Structure formats: C-alpha cells, structure tokens
C-alpha cells in the first residue's frame, strides 16, 4: 500500500481547473482552467513558475509533447492552441471543430496532435503546419477523451455515446468498437503503458480494465463517486501498480490495479477532485478541484 | 467546460 502524504497546495487559478498534466521531463506541472489560464508550476517544490493566456473561453485539457517543449490546450472557445512553454508564444491555434474542444494529446513522436469536441468528432492535427488533416466520424455524442498508444499507431476514443472506439492513426479506419452493458457514457479512456489494454471510466461509478482487442473486461474498480464530471485516470507505475482517480466526493481514489482493492484515499480537497495526473519517475500524484476549491495538490509517497 | 457538470440521466 502506498502512503501518499501532501506536500503542496497550488493556489492561485481563479476558476475551476480542469486538467493537470506533468511534463515527460519530470520538471514541471502544467494546469488548465475555466478561467481561461493555463500555469506552470515546479513538479517537485510546487512552486508557481508562469501563465500561459490567449484563448478566449474556458480550457478543458491540456496535453505536452514528448520533448517536454510544447504545450497544446482544449478550449470552448472551439480551437485548440499549441504553445512554445519557455517563451508563452502561442505557436498556432488548430482551427475546424464547430463546438467545445474538450480532450487532447500529442502522439509519441509529437508530430501531430488529437482532439475530441462536442461536435462529435475526432480530429487529427499536424503540429508543425496546424492543419487538419483528419476528421473521423466518431461518435454520436460529445467526445470525452482522446489518446494515443505507445507508438502512435491506434487513438483510443470515448463518448457520452457509451462507446470506446480504437483507431488506425494512418488510415482513419475504426478497428474497434467497444461495447459494454447498458451503455453507460463514457467519460474517460486511455491506453494502459504498454498498449495492450484501455482503462475506461463511466458515469456509473465505475473505472474499468478492458483488454479491447478481445471485447473482455478485466478489472472493475469501484468505490469512488463519478456519475457527473468527465474525471481522469491514471495508470500508476513508478512504485507499486495502482489506478489512480479522481473523485466526486473530493477525494482522491487509488486502487491495487491486479486486486481491485482500494489502497488509500486522499483527503482535504473541497470540491470534485476532476484530475489527477501521475509523475513520470517518481511517487507523486498532483490532483486539482473544481469551483468550490481551485486548487491543486501534490502528494508523494515512500513506494 | 469540463469544469461543469453533466446532469444525469433520469
């Protein structure tokens, strides 16, 4: 069992955050907001390094390239926005969704970019130009997240549709769609490390393990509240093997990944805790809450 | 905004 202690509170956005994110570097936080801001803080000491500006609306996500340089940011203002982090610039703004832009992420390579809208859509980008060079008919629904897998071949999609779906990044064919019972939304999909599964989040209280070339679930973890928020998860791996997530009763949920049971809850958030994010070599979670809070933590553990 | 909240189904 892991011992996660809190180390920092980061104050200082003045709205909901939405998304917290560590560099791949290890470096560095960054958070985005519905105060339109995006910050970065220190990874290790949390302490507050700068703010990004330019969108017009509120920010739903916000992702890195692999070389720990860019940053791009999901936006309701309907565009997303690449931005150079050591000098603010914003590089250029990713034009084409007709609604919200709410999820997104760099492929490995981080030559091109993927977003998930309230039009329904899954758009692929390319960074260096900013063009569209995709738009796959995705879903029926909003789309709540978007990923890519280990080597940038398959994106992962999830949909208030109650669907998952995996796409060729080459072809834009639809390889897989996942089905589960009932249907409920899906509210937050990503591939596992090593690209062989998908860890989905509905709006049933419930995170689950699928190995999705098979259409079989392989782990259930419950225990937490999400029947409202689009909360992300985690796949924790620099010590013990635990799922990491958010919460709608502002805490802070981790799970032994193989037996489902719950290892530890984080307290003293107060409001929905909507993001957690997981450091790239070390034990530290950083989890950030909506309105009622505004802040953001990082919390570190011995294993 | 993900920040606001999707009212359940009923």
């Known amino acids: 069992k892991p011992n996660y202690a809190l180390k920092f509170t980061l104050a200082g956005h003045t709205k909901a955050v939405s998304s917290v994110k560590f560099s791949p570097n290890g470096e560095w936080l960054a958070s985005s907001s519905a105060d339109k801001l995006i910050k970065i803080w220190g990874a290790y000491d949390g302490k507050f390094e700068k703010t990004i500006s330019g969108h017009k609306l509120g920010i739903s996500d916000v992702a890195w390239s692999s070389d720990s340089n860019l940053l791009v940011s999901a936006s309701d203002d309907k565009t997303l926005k690449i931005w150079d982090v050591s000098s603010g610039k914003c590089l250029k703004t990713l034009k084409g969704h007709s609604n919200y832009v709410f999820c997104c992420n760099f492929n490995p390579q ?84 090593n690209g062989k599964y998908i860890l989905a989040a509905t709006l049933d209280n419930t995170l689950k393990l699928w190995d999705y070339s098979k259409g079989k679930c392989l782990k259930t973890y419950t225990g937490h509240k999400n029947e409202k928020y689009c909360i992300f998860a985690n796949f924790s791996v620099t010590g013990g093997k635990w799922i990491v997530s958010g919460s709608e009763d502002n805490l802070v949920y981790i799970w032994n990944l193989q037996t489902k049971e719950i290892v530890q809850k ?10 957690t994010a997981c450091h790239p070599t070390e034990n530290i979670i950083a989890s950030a809450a909506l309105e009622n809070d505004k802040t953001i933590k990082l919390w570190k553990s011995d294993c | 905004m993900r920040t606001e909240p999707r009212p359940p189904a009923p």
């Open chain 1, 110 to 193: 981080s030559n091109l970019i993927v977003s998930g809208s309230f039009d329904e859509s899954v758009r692929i980008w390319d960074v260096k130009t900013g063009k569209c060079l995709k738009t796959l008919p995705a879903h029926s629904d909003p789309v709540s997240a978007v990923h890519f897998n280990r080597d940038g071949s398959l994106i992962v999609s999830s949909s208030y549709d109650g669907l998952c779906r995996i796409w060729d990044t080459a072809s834009g064919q639809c390889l897989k769609t996942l089905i589960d019972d009932d249907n409920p939304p899906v509210s937050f999909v990503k591939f596992s490390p």
């Open chain 1, 266 to 275: 984080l307290q003293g958030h107060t409001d929905v805790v909507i993001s």
